[PDB]
Write a protein that binds this ligand. Structure first.
Ligand SMILES: *CC(=O)NCCc1ccc(S(=O)(=O)NC(=O)Nc2cccc(Br)c2)cc1
Ligand SMILES: *CC(=O)NCCc1ccc(S(=O)(=O)NC(=O)Nc2cccc(Br)c2)cc1
Ligand SMILES: *CC(=O)NCCc1ccc(S(=O)(=O)NC(=O)Nc2cccc(Br)c2)cc1
Ligand SMILES: CC(=O)NCCc1ccc(S(=O)(=O)NC(=O)Nc2cccc(Br)c2)cc1
Ligand SMILES: [Mg+2]
Ligand SMILES: [Mg+2]
Ligand SMILES: [Mg+2]
Lengths: 325, 319, 321, 319
């Protein structure tokens, strides 16, 4: 039987006898994802370039901004949210009381900034929490560890557009059919391969690597047990590198260095959702000192080192990292 | 004022007083590329999954290019990564151009959904005899045109001819390639280096040393950023757009390289050179290699002129 | 704020505290409609004409397959009646839900070649009998409808959805594959200035129809004559009547003495949209929604549209009986 | 063998040894039609409705045809239904063609989502005088090309030249017009009549009687069916594919009809005659009327030859 995102989550929520708020939230997010995807593929660009004589110029917003406006407005209008956090805004957004719902959403609306003009894959990252404080909604309601996530996932705008959705029961992948604006379930209950043959990180920072990271990269290029060396792949858009990690197995790293001794990626709307997806797919995601989902944040925009992927590959890193204490 | 690929090639062709054949070829090619793009973006994937109750992409893409070029009446010999021998166009559909192409580069890659693309090179048939596979065996310097479609976050067609390089963005709302970057010239020096560092075990000493200079620069300029998508069209297009260098060098475990000269290296070398960049094997300009096999491999180092010269300077050292 | 049909229906179902079966059905139907729309607009026809080399299914058949399969897999239906199928389709026990659905999947395939508007009409009933599901479950009068409407594949693709609360109009934005709410709680004009019917049957008309048409062309009260429009595709003609007002007629004639259009999946849904939007829909003898069907493909006369216009016709009809 | 409009028109032009200007005009025109089609199908309408937190469609359509034709370098005078005066292309862009068009016909009824259409007629400029509105005052006999795009269930482009009539279906997945019917001919006698019978009180006695013969055939044959969409493109296209007759004749409020000669009646009369049909005002063939005003009106009765002839017989009976 064919299944669409909207239908599949509708049925799953019926089973759980939930209130239908999470389902509304997801549906609204999917609409935003379809609009962002249409914009990323440059629908209408000919009007930007004067096909009508440059009387017709949204449309003129940059994709960062449009993407953020779409997720914001769509989540606001889902009636399912009360506090929203984006890489685009300094302070958490507090939803109009008439629109307030029970969920808290942290999201990167368009990950892949140094990378749109070259046309590499970009994505949307999201993580969804429930409001736990009894207080008025405020920035504090977004300061929860990744372990409190009810749902996280991402949309990858690559050669095709895919939405990966993780909840505590597992991870599902939905391919967008652009001919009908529907997310087709193509892979239920995904699990990451136990050990992969790809390592992923920016090696240009080699001069700033911790010696534990320097050694782990060495072990993949010159295996001590004379096993075959891993292959290297680094897209530089975190949504693409993590998805490849999910689908082919292996390891992805943005560890701590000099330009960022706490890593570069943000905990609430980059690191936590990829950790949540990975753990629920049978993978790992560590800062080196702990599980990413256990870091209790104090700033919605705080960074964190992240090392994730196939569990055997992350354990191996963890061994090399203990050895350097 | 707005322009489209087909309009632009049509006026540039009329200005040069040619026969229209190359314009026909490229328009047929454009149609194939838009149909490949549609399949890569997975239009109609819901029917494959039983929404109403059979080829993989690379076979489909080869058929799209093969057929669109045969019926253009502009070609005589067509070489594809997908076919062991050259396809000779049947006599009634024969034109004077030879096309070598990769219909869909990116294979360890479709299933993880990162950028794929079509690469192509167009040679004019010199000889007056019956077309054969020999006619595709020309150096890249004889290229009349070359380029690539990148099915990235959006679909872009890059077209290099003798005059220069132009970039056309596909607007899927109307299915037109829109001219967005005219007479593109690559940065003289870039800040990104691109290669699979998993082969460090097998690198020739010069690569090992040149890479080290990117990580620990001998003039205390900042290290280069590293980027490697694993899809040559994506890596080469980023190189053209932001500058820097792309390397698929001869390791000692395939001393001729991995990428294919006629339909991966030569087109990318042509695009680089016509945009003021370079592309070398280490021993000569990629475009100067004389081929003996339509499927032969070459090592490739291309990108910004100062970056390629720098790798070459290291390369001469190691002799 | 912006609203989509998926969000709107979902939010309305939550307030109403229903079980979600209707919402599920409506989500499946919307998905099938987007796929019919894509095929009707001929996306991919290059492949039919050999773009990939020397080389599937009529639009009629594919459209029916799309509605059939999406409704079956919604788990919300038990009996499905289609213009395309001689017999009512009985849903497999393991995918059976509460709802009976009667539909024309592609209304107007005698108009596909000339490329004019086609459409999908649908009416949704709660299964009423407790018997094993069968054709009889589709024989309810239109009064019993819980939801009805159509999709118009015209210059753009619209979906009109009627429930007991009223009529809403959704525009398909094909860039995102989302049905966007553009008209909330629409109501037909009290009186229109257009009349719509195939006047080529004039030789076979009843004297009532004959007199009513004359009043439109030569108004005894010397006011301006009505304009005439007739696409010959019911979804297009009914939709114009909704948005612009007036009257649409497909009466019986001597050659088709029970009428031409079909009661279960053309007249009843259109009558339901019309009544829920403040209009009327009659056979002349009774309200269309009050006819008790006996056969799933039976035909009915219909005269529908702006209330003043239908009442006028009925005044002409009563004079002649 | 598959064919697209651009390839087909281009190959035909090679064979006729033309300058290529007409090919370029038509390609420009095709691109405008794909852009009008996208807008008519409401692509992007969600953004107008607040999805991210209002030029009339036919004004945007006019801008698209205007701008693509100006920048084609094939035109010099543009006459649109949307514009009071002829538009004069700027000197540096002037080509040799005059184009008369309705950018979005039936578009005062876009609200009912009925079919809309684009109608066009392409003339060769006849004098060397500074371009002016007088260059559009040619009789339809002088047409080099004419046709229309129908924005209906699908988008179709119908293109009439001297050789005949071809129908191209737009595949929106790839933005190509595919040749689906070559050298179309209207059938000799039809069974549909099309006109607004709301005008019955003001009809010419010949129109009253002719239509009465459609409903009550004196040879006791089967009556015709009636259809009237109210968008000329849809009514004429159905007349073309199914045969029959379409009427917007003269009467009271209109001794010269309501439809306009240059960009409604002439292109449709040209399409009809190239398909073997007819198109009359009653007194003269539509294509022979010499216009004096770019917006002047003409009565029109067109379609299958047997049917138009039968109308003219009733018409002469009342003359
Ligand atoms: C991993 C997994 O499958 N989790 C369950 C998915 C799920 C759970 C709960 C919801 S909900 O609370 O937002 N929606 C819900 O309960 N909807 C509903 C649907 C149909 C009928 C009814 Br009465 C209620 C969503 C998804
Ligand atoms: C015109 C009008 O407003 N009619 C009422 C609309 C309506 C729509 C759907 C239903 S239902 O039977 O399908 N119930 C339903 O969807 N419930 C529900 C509950 C909790 C979560 C969800 Br996502 C859905 C009833 C009435
Ligand atoms: C009726 C029919 O069969 N074909 C239309 C004939 C036609 C079309 C276009 C032109 S042109 O004026 O634009 N000239 C042209 O296309 N020239 C051309 C094209 C390609 C190669 C060459 Br060498 C020349 C004329 C006639
Ligand atoms: C680099 C640059 O800036 N320009 C060269 C581009 C180019 C493209 C096509 C051709 S060509 O060989 O194909 N020449 C024609 O096509 N001429 C033509 C003739 C009649 C009608 C039409 Br329509 C076109 C030559 C050069
Ligand atoms: Mg980011
Ligand atoms: Mg290859
Ligand atoms: Mg029907």
């Amino acid at each position: 039987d064919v299944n669409t995102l909207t239908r599949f989550v509708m049925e799953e929520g019926r089973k759980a006898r939930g209130t239908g708020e999470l389902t509304q939230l997801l549906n609204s997010l999917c609409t935003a994802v379809k609009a962002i995807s249409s914009a990323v593929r440059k629908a209408g660009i000919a009007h930007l370039y004067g096909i009508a004589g440059s009387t017709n110029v949204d449309q003129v917003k940059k994709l960062d901004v449009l993407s953020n406006d779409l997720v914001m407005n769509m989540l606001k209008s889902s009636f399912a949210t009360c506090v929203l956090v984006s890489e685009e805004d300094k302070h958490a957004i507090i939803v109009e009381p008439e629109k307030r719902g029970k969920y808290v959403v942290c999201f990167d609306p368009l990950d892949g900034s140094s990378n749109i003009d070259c046309l590499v894959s970009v994505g949307t990252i999201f993580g969804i929490y429930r409001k736990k404080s009894t207080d008025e909604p405020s920035e504090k309601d977004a300061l929860q560890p990744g372990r409190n996530l009810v749902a996280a996932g991402y949309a990858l705008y690559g050669s095709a557009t895919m939405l990966v959705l993780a909840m505590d029961c597992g991870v599902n992948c939905f391919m967008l059919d652009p001919a009908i604006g529907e997310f087709i379930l193509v892979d239920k209950d995904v699990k990451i391969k136990k050990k992969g043959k790809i390592y992923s990180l920016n090696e240009g920072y080699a001069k700033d690597f911790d010696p534990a990271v320097t050694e782990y990269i060495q072990r993949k290029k010159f295996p001590p047990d004379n096993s075959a060396p891993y292959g290297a792949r680094y897209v530089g858009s975190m949504v693409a590198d993590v998805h490849r990690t999910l689908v082919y197995g292996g390891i992805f790293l943005y560890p701590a260095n000099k330009k960022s001794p706490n890593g570069k990626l943000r905990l609430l709307y980059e690191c936590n959702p990829m950790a949540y997806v990975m753990e629920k797919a049978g993978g790992m995601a560590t800062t080196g000192k702990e599980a990413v989902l256990d870091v209790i944040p104090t700033d919605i925009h705080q960074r964190a080192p992240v090392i994730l992927g196939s569990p055997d590959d992350v354990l191996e890193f963890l061994k090399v990292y203990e050895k350097h204490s």
